[PDB]
């Protein structure tokens, strides 16, 4: 789970401890499959459970590590 924890730091470029839509864009675009803003938003829409629009630590953990 180390890579997941460190990933949050790699995704967060502004250094606020939060993965914003604009931040996720740069992450998922460099990945290769560059989707549209809507799809990027969709990503966090299904990656958001607390109802804030962004993915926090807990949300990131639960979404990635689903039991």
């Amino acid at each position: 789970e180390e890579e997941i924890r460190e990933a949050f730091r790699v995704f967060d470029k502004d250094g606020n401890g939060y993965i914003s839509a604009a931040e996720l864009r740069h992450v998922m675009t460099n990945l290769g499959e560059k989707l549209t803003d809507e799809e990027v938003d969709e990503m966090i829409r299904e990656a958001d459970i607390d109802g804030d629009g962004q993915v926090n630590y807990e949300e990131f953990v639960q979404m990635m590590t689903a039991k």
Binding site: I4, A7, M28, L31, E33, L35, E39, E46, A47, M63
Partner: peptide
Amino acid sequence: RAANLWPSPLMIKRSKKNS
């Protein structure tokens, strides 16, 4: 449904570790 794309850079992190 790009959810799997979230684990995509995540997997890349593990790949970057190998790299």
